[PDB]
């Protein structure tokens, strides 16, 4: 409760040493905020790789869903955090998780033009033909934004 709230705050803020002491002192690694975020969601959202790893080594729920169905992998992929994407997948994150909008991590990375993350997701089994709520594939998204490089990757798949 108390420590879980502090852990959520420290994970969002990138306070690695406070995350460490809170975990040592018994904080719930899967504490939820009002939005349904866990510490792992917040560290992934904010690019805090070391905190992501600490949380995972303490049994964080790698596929936790927030109030809109986003997993930590969704947030890391959208926000361009390549190493975090890789560690989440290593610990069993669902590469094809759908959030409540119907986006997969591949859609989110494609929206933002995160080339290296698109390639990692595909290598780990992302469905290249998955359609979003409006029938768009990652390829269609890349064409929408005039991203030649990203389109070149997905066109041949």
């Amino acid at each position: 409760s108390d420590l879980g709230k502090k852990l959520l705050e420290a994970a969002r803020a990138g306070q690695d040493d406070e995350v460490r002491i809170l975990m040592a002192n018994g904080a719930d690694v899967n504490a939820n905020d009002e939005y349904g975020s866990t510490p792992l969601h917040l560290a992934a959202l904010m690019g805090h790789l070391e905190i992501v790893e600490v949380l995972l080594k303490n049994g964080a729920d790698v596929n936790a869903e927030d109030t809109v169905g986003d997993t930590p992998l969704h947030l890391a992929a959208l926000n361009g955090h390549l190493e975090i994407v890789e560690v989440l997948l290593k610990y069993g994150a669902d590469v094809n998780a759908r959030d409540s909008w119907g986006d997969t991590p591949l859609h989110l990375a494609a929206h933002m033009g995160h080339l290296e993350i698109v390639e990692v997701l595909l290598k780990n089994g992302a469905d290249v033909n998955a359609q979003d709520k409006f029938g768009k594939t990652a390829f269609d998204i890349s064409i929408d934004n005039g991203n030649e490089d990203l389109a070149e990757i997905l066109q041949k798949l």
Partner: protein, 129 residues
């Protein structure tokens, strides 16, 4: 209309949201993705009898009039239908009335929880603006 990211960034720039109340353009694009998935026709019914309309999911109790919401305030002085247009002008103008100072984007819970503090520059990168 469902916008793409760069198309929406260009429209929001055209309508003067870049640096509005000090919020750089990517904040507004990020907020739109989480609120509506870039869909100008998005609607969401709430248990309190109001509905959220449009690309920024603006609420019919406080901000726009939909004629079916108890306790309508209509502070933007606009029919909610204007917030479903393919043209984002009315949504932008109402968003500008909602955001009256440099903390006003807290009007969107999703912006606070998913956009604030992130690399909002990425949302406007690659768009030839």
């Amino acid at each position: 209309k469902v916008f793409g990211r760069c198309e929406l960034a260009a429209a929001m720039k055209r309508h003067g949201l870049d640096n509005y109340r000090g919020y750089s353009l990517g904040n507004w694009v990020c907020a739109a993705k989480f609120e509506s998935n870039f869909n100008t026709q998005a609607t969401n019914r709430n248990t309190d009898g109001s509905t959220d309309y449009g690309i920024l999911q603006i609420n019919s109790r406080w901000w726009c009039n939909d004629g079916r919401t108890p306790g309508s305030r209509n502070l933007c002085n606009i029919p909610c239908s204007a917030l479903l247009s393919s043209d984002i002008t009315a949504s932008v103008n109402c968003a500008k009335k909602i955001v009256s100072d440099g903390n006003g984007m807290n009007a969107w819970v999703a912006w606070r929880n998913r956009c604030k503090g992130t690399d909002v520059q990425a949302w406007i990168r690659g768009c030839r603006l």
